[PDB]
Write a protein that binds this ligand. Sequence first.
Ligand SMILES: Nc1ncnc2c1ncn2[C@@H]1O[C@H](COP(=O)(O)OP(=O)(O)OP(=O)(O)O)[C@@H](O)[C@H]1O
Ligand SMILES: [Ca+2]
Ligand SMILES: [Ca+2]
Length: 993
Amino acid sequence: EQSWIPKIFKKKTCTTFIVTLCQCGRPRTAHPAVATVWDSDAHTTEKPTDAYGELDFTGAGRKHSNFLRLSDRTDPAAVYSLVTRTWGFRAPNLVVSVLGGSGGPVLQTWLQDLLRRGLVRAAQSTGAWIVTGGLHTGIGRHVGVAVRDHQMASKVVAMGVAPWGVVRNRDTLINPKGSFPARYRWRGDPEDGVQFPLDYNYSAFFLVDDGTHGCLGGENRFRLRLESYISQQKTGVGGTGIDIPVLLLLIDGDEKMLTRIENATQAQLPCLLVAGSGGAADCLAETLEDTLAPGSGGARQGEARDRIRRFFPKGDLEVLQAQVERIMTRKELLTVYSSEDGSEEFETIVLKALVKACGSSEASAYLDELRLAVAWNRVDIAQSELFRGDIQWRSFHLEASLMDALLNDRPEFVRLLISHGLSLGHFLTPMRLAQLYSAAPSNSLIRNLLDQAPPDVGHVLRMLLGKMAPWSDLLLWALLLNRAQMAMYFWEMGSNAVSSALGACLLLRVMARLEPDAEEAARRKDLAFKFEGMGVDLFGECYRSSEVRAARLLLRRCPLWGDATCLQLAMQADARAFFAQDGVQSLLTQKWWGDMASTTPIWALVLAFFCPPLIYTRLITFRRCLRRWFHFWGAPVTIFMGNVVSYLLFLLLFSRVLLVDFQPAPPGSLELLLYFWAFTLLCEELRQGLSGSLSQRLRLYLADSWNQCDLVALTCFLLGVGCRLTPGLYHLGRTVLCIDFMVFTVRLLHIFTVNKQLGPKIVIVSKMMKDVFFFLFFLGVWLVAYGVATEGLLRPRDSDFPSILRRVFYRPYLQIFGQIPQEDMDVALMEHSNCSSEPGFWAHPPGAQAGTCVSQYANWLVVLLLVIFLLVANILLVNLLIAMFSYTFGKVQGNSDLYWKAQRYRLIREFHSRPALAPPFIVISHLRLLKEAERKLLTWESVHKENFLLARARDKRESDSERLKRTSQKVDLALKQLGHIREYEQRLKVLER
Ligand SMILES: Nc1ncnc2c1ncn2[C@@H]1O[C@H](COP(=O)(O)OP(=O)(O)OP(=O)(O)O)[C@@H](O)[C@H]1O
Ligand SMILES: [Ca+2]
Ligand SMILES: [Ca+2]
């Protein structure tokens, strides 16, 4: 497609010969037959360019580097259009040109670090072009090293301009037919003076042609022209975009640099000067330090500075001084970047210069500076300069900045922008949302959900949760992209603060659980905790302000973006901290007691329960008669107690049947009653699971450990009854029921989960299993070791596999509990007799299962092992176990308490929906079974929210650290004025003459 390049461009040639050596600098065999001070255009011929192509540097590289040869007398528009269109280079959001000679093989270490850290990172963040000398020499070489080093730790496109004559290895460049690929001998062994190679760090090269064999300054005119054109160009979308800022960064140099900066200053191009660069750079910085220095006593100083700051040759010459005066004539444009002892940052300095350079007030030329302020994180500068108030603004003007801030995750900026009266409601558009959700990072988790899923966010949430106002949308977006600060601010401006906070906590925890990155989850978890901590803090403030209002309505109400009440959101989120609050705990307790006063003594309840008429007296504090009756019997607490009493009777009946009434004969009256009673238990448990999305509710019901205990209990009961009825399995049926009774009794621990002083204990017990298993495994190993060894020594003659196991495992086990059968191990306590022809001596233990007769070869060893076994198992292990419990108990006591408090809600809800009657009678119940205030409330919530925020923010401001920070700043301001006053005193003293 590059076929048309040669026509537009041309390669200049010396043509005419100007005086062995030729003034044009191309001494060859002979100039053309056609061939005084030589001139660039007077004695040159323009011919079609014969060096365009893309370099492919030998060895390491991207195999893509555009090389172009062009004449000096060429419009910058053509090259820029070619650069923007053909090579695919994007419109530069910023362009910063590096200039200077930087005499010496290497530059100062600090200066190199400044270049690589400051310049390169800033360009990469904003994707700024960096035009420099397209050669592997001096400053250009340093830049390439900086680009190379930055790239390695990763792209920053950094074009280069170099005169054609100076380029080395130009033979492979020359190709009139064009060279889409091209091999360059960049590793040029001979470093032959002026000729230099092309540094391969740069992406594109503008080989300025002026009909010379190598010279310097021939690219100045073209370079500046291109600088001006880019300074007068709009980025993308034709002219609908905004101007492209341009900066000239100078580092040391010579008088030639001084002319370049003067020409650039004439073209209204911002310039920045690095302090400490050296000659041709410090002199200007010094002049700025003096600024409007008095003519008397300083007029000759300029000569002194040229003498010392600049090289003596031509330094005494007043030509340099004249340029400095012209340079200072436009001192507004240029500035000085003080190293500030390795400051290492210059985004503020760059922005400060640009705003100074603008000098406008229409706010139409400050969009580019604003965008750069947004792209970089510097926001304090933006408000200080862009929003000092000297310039008005409009919503459309801020729309672009807002979008970039959001996409680039610039929280401080979006806060600032919104602070300036931006009509957010009229701003948001469905298209913009699509842009936002399209701004997910590469193959992010959100992308996966979108890919599986036109934002279509509703489907995403419906999938995430389980499928069971602009602020809300922004908050939701921020949460999905995990822009913590963005979300935090949005929630701050939200409406349903407490509900939103919990919703956000739920979403992040679900997102983190599903996040496979294994690292983003940590950040999501952290943010979730932050929101929960924020929501809990807010609610506590609301609860103190107005108990009935907040508690009752603000939670029990139906929530937003869901159908499960606000508490259920907390339950899903497992917001342990939120439930731990006194307000919620008090609220739950109130619901636990139903209509009865939560302060009702427990004994009072029991007496009423056994004396139903006693409810109507003043003992219990809360048609009227019927209403009170149902209120008493409908409260969750009474349902719980009524259920407990029934359960105890069930066990009592079970034991009575099991111990006595159970016989091989067909079931008796009580046995049948138990069956019906048990069957009713099954029916009730079925209702719980079926009314906990069939697969969903079934699964969640199974999740409860207690419900698992119920299932296993009932199933065993079914097997027991089934086996019992069958003619030939009476014994097996009885056996399994006995075990079944054990399961039912153990289920009785659910009762202790209610009391506040016991519920935490049960939780802690659940966490001790780790220690118990350690003890068992350690003990199991020891028993096997000791048991087998002891059995081996004795050599009992029974040697029957059941008995062998008894002695190997059972007997040593009991020894742990003080059951030590000495007469079965110690030969001293046993009779001596003859048992078998096997050689040796034998003894006859008296025990029944101790073996008919054991060897006594080395019996002292058996006793010795017994001594060791007791020492280890009976003292060390048991005591070690006690130590582990003590440590574990102390550690997990705090967390266990929170877990119980959170679980307390689940219990209450479970008994809230249970039918009134008790299990034995519950059958009948089963048979019988088969707006302005909201606005008022929301406003009340929000007012408390901001009060809480203002108090928190004010607290931060009053903190010591902030006072110290503010104090230091005021001192600096005071020091500033003192200096100005000192200058005022000096001038007045001079005027005193
Ligand atoms: N256009 C270029 N010409 C020469 N060196 C370049 C160029 N671009 C980058 N470099 C790097 O600059 C350094 C040039 O010095 P030089 O190659 O002599 O030293 P080196 O890295 O120790 O390796 P060696 O001397 O073995 O090639 C190398 O790191 C080379 O990779
Ligand atoms: Ca501008
Ligand atoms: Ca149950």
